[PDB]
Amino acid sequence: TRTYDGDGYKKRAACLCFRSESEEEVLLVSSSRHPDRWIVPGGGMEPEEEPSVAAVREVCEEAGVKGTLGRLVGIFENQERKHRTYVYVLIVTEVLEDWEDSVNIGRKREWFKIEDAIKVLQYHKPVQASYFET
Ligand SMILES: O=P(O)(O)CP(=O)(O)O[C@@H]1[C@@H](OP(=O)(O)O)[C@H](OP(=O)(O)CP(=O)(O)O)[C@H](OP(=O)(O)O)[C@H](OP(=O)(O)O)[C@H]1OP(=O)(O)O
């Protein structure tokens, strides 16, 4: 079930999934619509679902990783898509081999140095590139 803020923006949560506490490499996943495009893993919050809980669930489903949830980075709007996304830091401690989106739609995942993640997100996902600019 999709959920919405009072202004009609779709509620979403996403994680910056870092390889380590150094926050030097981050996990991106492929788009299902365009498998040659990279995005930050995230998606819709369920009814009454805490944003931090949604963030952890979405990363598990989309990226097949678990770890230690850190700070809320911020709340980011995509005016074009009418999205409002809570973005968290996650330090990855478990990498699972056969996760929900791999099995179901063949979603890919890849480690990126921060500067290269910002580069690949800039064209289609400038708001996701801004997640890192803190
Ligand atoms: O596909 P996933 O959820 O993994 C990633 P994302 O949501 O970013 O994919 C969107 C897609 O949305 P969705 O597939 O319906 O959720 C868009 O679709 P919608 O927002 O539903 C617009 P639609 O109703 O499909 O015309 C539109 O895909 P499309 O329209 O080209 O199929 C975007 O592509 P673009 O056309 O903006 O370059 C594409 O963005 P991408 O991440 O591929 O750059």
Question: What would you note in describing this structure?
Answer:
It is classed as hydrolase. The entry lists the keywords phosphatase, nudix, catalysis mechanism, Substrate Specificity, inositol, inositol pyrophosphate, hydrolase. The assembly is monomeric. There is one protein chain. The radius of gyration is 14 Å and the shape is globular. It has one domain. The strands form two sheets. Strands 4-1-6-5 form a four-stranded mixed beta sheet, covered by helices on one side. The protein is 24% helix and 39% strand. The chain is an alpha+beta fold. The structure holds ligand 4WZ. Residues 31-34, 37, 39, 81, 124 line the site of ligand 4WZ. Ligand 4WZ is lined by residues 31-34, 37, 39, 81, 124.
Q: Concise description?
A:
The chain has helices at residues 51-63, 100-105, 114-121, 126-130, and strands spanning 10-18, 25-30, 38-39, 42-44, 65-78, 83-95, 109-113. It is an alpha+beta fold. It is classed as hydrolase.
Radius of gyration: 14 Å
Number of domains: 1
The proportion of residues forming helix, as a percent range, comes to 10-25%
Enumerate the distinct ligands.
ligand 4WZ
- Number of helical elements: 4
User: Tell me, what's the shape?
Assistant: globular
Largest sheet: 4 strands, mixed
Helices and strands, in order, run as EEEEHEEHEHH
Number of strands: 7
